[PDB]
C-alpha cells in the first residue's frame, strides 16, 4: 500500500508536513484528502495539468506542505494515487494532524428525567449529556441518592464537534418500578482532574 | 451539481447487496469513471472500482468474485451489485466520481485521472441477521426558567444511523445531536438537543423531526412542556 | 456525429530515397501544422 506517517502535529503558525510514499509515485501523480471524525473527507490536492495546501515530489515520495495550521485542520490526511497499470487506485494509512496546546475545555453536563410517556412504557432512560470539551477524556460515575449504581449504566465515546472539541452520552436502563422508589439522581464527570454532579428527583421539577 | 444515493441499509449474511448513485443535475456526467468506496466504523477508505460509460469498468483484486458495476445512463445512474455480504463488510458506503479531464482527444492519450472529487454523504451498511426496528421518541421537556435547554430521547432502534433536525429542519446553528448506544438488548438509542431560551415558553407549538433512515418510518411527536 | 483518427509519430531526420550516402535533418517548424487530401489509391499485396 501506500505509506504515510501516523502522525505529525505541530504548534498553530508553523508548518506540518504529511508525506506519501509507495511503488507508483516513480511514474504517478499524488492526490490527497482530509476526512474529519464521521465527516466526509475533504479533496485538497488535484491532477491539475499534464488556499493553504500544497505536495512535493521526491524520488519516491510526496510531501504535504500545511503552512500554518489550526484548529479546523485537526482531522485525518489519506494521501492517494493510482497504479503504474492504472487498473486500480489506492490510498494511505492516514495521518491524524493534531494542533498542539489546544485549550483545556472542562465538561458541560445536561441531566433530564424520564418522560411522561417512558414510565407509562415501562422503561426509565435516564439522560446525562456532556458537550464542549477538550482534550478527548471523561470520566463518569453515576450515584442513585449517594450511593453508586452497579448495573444499568451505558456510555458512548468521545465525538469531535462542530467546534472541533469533544462530546459524548450516557444513560441508565431502570424501571418505572426504580426511579420512584429512591430519593434522588446525580450524574458525576471527571474531566482532567475536575468535575461536577447534577441532582434531579421523582419529586422535584 | 449534486451526488445522491438509494439503497437498503442493512445486509444479511451470505445474500446479495445492491446500490444506487443518481446524476440529479449535471453537464458533464458521461465524461468520468463512476466509482465506490466503503470505509469501517471510524477506519479507512478503500476503493471498488469505477465504471466509464462506455462499460469498461474497472474493479479491485479482491472482490473479483463478488461484485460488478452497471450502468443506466438513462438518468444517468450506475449500480453496484455485490454478493457474499458478511459481518466484516460492515460499514459506511459512500458512492464517488473520478474525474477525466481531457483537452481534445482520447485515444492518443491527452487525458488524465483528475480525481475523486465528488462524493456521497454515506449510507451505512451494516451486516446482519437481526431486525429494523422503527423508533420510539420521548419528550425531554424543558427547563421552566432567559435561556433554558431541552432535547428528545430516541430509543429502541436498529441499524445506524439516525439523523435528525427540529422544526422541519430550521435549526442547526447551536445544535447537539449525540451519539447512539446499542443497549445491551441490541438496539440502538440516542439523543437530541435544542438551545432553545426560556420567554416564548407560552404560545409555540415546537415540533421535533426524527428520521430512521433505515426504517422509512419518519416521525412528528410534539415534545409538549413540563407541566 | 463525430470522427476518427490514426496515431502518428512525428520524425525529422531520414535516409529516403536509397540514395546510399544522403540522410539530412527537417527543420523543426513553428505553429501547429495542418494538411489536408483527398485519399485516392493504396499498395497491398496477398497471400499464397
Known amino acids: 500500500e501506500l505509506t504515510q506517517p501516523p502522525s505529525v502535529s505541530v504548534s498553530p503558525g508553523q508548518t506540518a508536513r504529511i508525506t506519501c510514499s509507495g511503488a507508483?509515485?516513480?511514474?504517478?501523480?499524488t492526490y490527497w484528502y482530509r476526512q474529519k471524525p464521521g465527516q466526509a473527507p475533504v479533496l485538497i490536492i488535484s491532477?491539475?495539468?499534464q488556499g493553504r495546501f500544497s505536495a512535493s515530489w521526491s524520488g519516491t515520495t510526496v510531501t504535504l506542505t500545511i503552512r500554518g495550521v489550526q484548529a479546523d485542520d485537526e482531522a485525518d490526511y489519506y494521501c492517494?494515487?493510482?497504479?503504474?497499470?492504472?487498473?486500480?487506485?489506492?490510498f494511505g494509512g492516514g495521518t491524524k494532524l493534531t494542533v498542539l496546546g489546544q485549550p483545556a475545555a472542562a465538561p458541560s453536563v445536561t441531566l433530564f428525567p424520564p418522560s411522561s410517556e417512558e414510565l407509562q412504557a415501562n422503561k426509565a432512560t435516564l439522560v446525562c449529556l456532556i458537550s464542549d470539551f477538550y482534550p478527548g477524556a471523561v470520566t463518569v460515575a453515576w450515584k442513585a441518592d449517594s450511593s453508586p449504581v452497579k448495573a444499568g449504566v451505558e456510555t458512548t465515546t468521545p465525538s469531535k464537534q462542530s467546534n472541533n472539541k469533544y462530546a459524548a452520552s450516557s444513560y441508565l436502563s431502570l424501571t418505572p418500578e426504580q426511579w420512584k422508589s429512591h430519593k434522588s439522581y446525580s450524574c458525576q464527570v471527571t474531566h482532567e482532574g475536575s468535575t461536577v454532579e447534577k441532582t434531579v428527583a421523582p419529586t422535584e421539577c | 451539481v449534486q451526488l445522491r444515493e438509494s439503497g437498503p441499509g442493512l445486509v444479511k449474511p451470505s445474500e446479495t447487496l445492491s446500490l444506487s448513485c443518481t446524476v440529479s443535475?449535471?453537464?458533464?456526467?458521461?465524461?468520468?469513471?463512476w466509482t465506490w468506496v466503503r470505509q469501517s466504523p471510524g477506519k479507512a477508505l478503500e476503493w471498488i472500482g469505477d465504471?466509464?460509460?462506455?462499460?469498461?469498468?474497472t474493479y479491485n483484486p479482491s472482490l473479483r468474485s463478488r461484485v460488478r458495476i452497471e450502468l443506466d445512463q438513462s438518468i444517468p445512474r450506475f449500480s453496484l451489485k455485490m454478493t457474499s455480504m458478511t459481518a466484516a463488510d460492515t460499514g459506511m458506503y459512500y458512492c464517488?466520481?473520478?474525474?477525466?479531464?481531457?483537452?481534445?482527444?482520447?485515444?492518443?492519450?491527452?487525458?488524465?485521472?483528475?480525481?475523486?472529487?465528488?462524493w456521497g454523504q454515506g449510507t451505512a451498511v451494516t451486516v446482519s441477521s437481526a431486525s429494523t426496528k422503527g423508533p420510539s421518541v420521548f419528550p425531554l421537556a424543558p427547563s421552566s426558567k432567559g435561556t433554558a435547554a431541552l432535547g428528545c430521547l430516541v430509543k429502541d432502534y436498529f441499524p445506524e444511523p439516525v439523523t435528525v433536525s427540529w422544526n422541519s429542519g430550521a435549526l442547526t446553528s447551536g445544535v447537539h445531536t449525540f451519539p447512539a448506544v446499542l443497549q445491551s438488548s441490541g438496539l440502538y438509542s440516542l439523543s437530541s438537543v435544542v438551545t432553545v431560551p426560556s420567554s416564548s415558553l407560552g404560545t409555540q407549538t415546537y415540533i421535533c423531526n426524527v428520521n430512521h433512515k433505515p426504517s422509512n418510518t419518519k416521525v412528528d411527536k410534539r415534545v409538549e412542556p413540563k407541566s | 456525429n463525430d470522427s476518427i483518427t490514426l496515431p502518428c509519430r512525428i520524425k525529422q531526420i531520414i535516409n529516403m530515397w536509397q540514395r546510399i550516402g544522403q540522410a539530412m535533418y527537417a527543420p523543426p517548424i513553428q505553429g501547429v501544422i495542418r494538411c489536408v487530401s483527398n485519399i485516392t489509391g493504396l499498395i497491398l499485396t496477398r497471400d499464397g
Open positions: 464517488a466520481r473520478n474525474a477525466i479531464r481531457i483537452y481534445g482527444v482520447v485515444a492518443l492519450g491527452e487525458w488524465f485521472h483528475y480525481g475523486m472529487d465528488v
Open positions: 443535475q449535471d453537464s458533464r456526467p458521461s465524461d468520468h469513471s
Open positions: 465504471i466509464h460509460y462506455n462499460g469498461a469498468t
Open positions: 507508483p509515485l516513480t511514474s504517478r501523480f
Open positions: 491532477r491539475s495539468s
Open positions: 492517494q494515487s493510482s497504479d503504474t497499470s492504472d487498473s486500480y487506485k489506492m
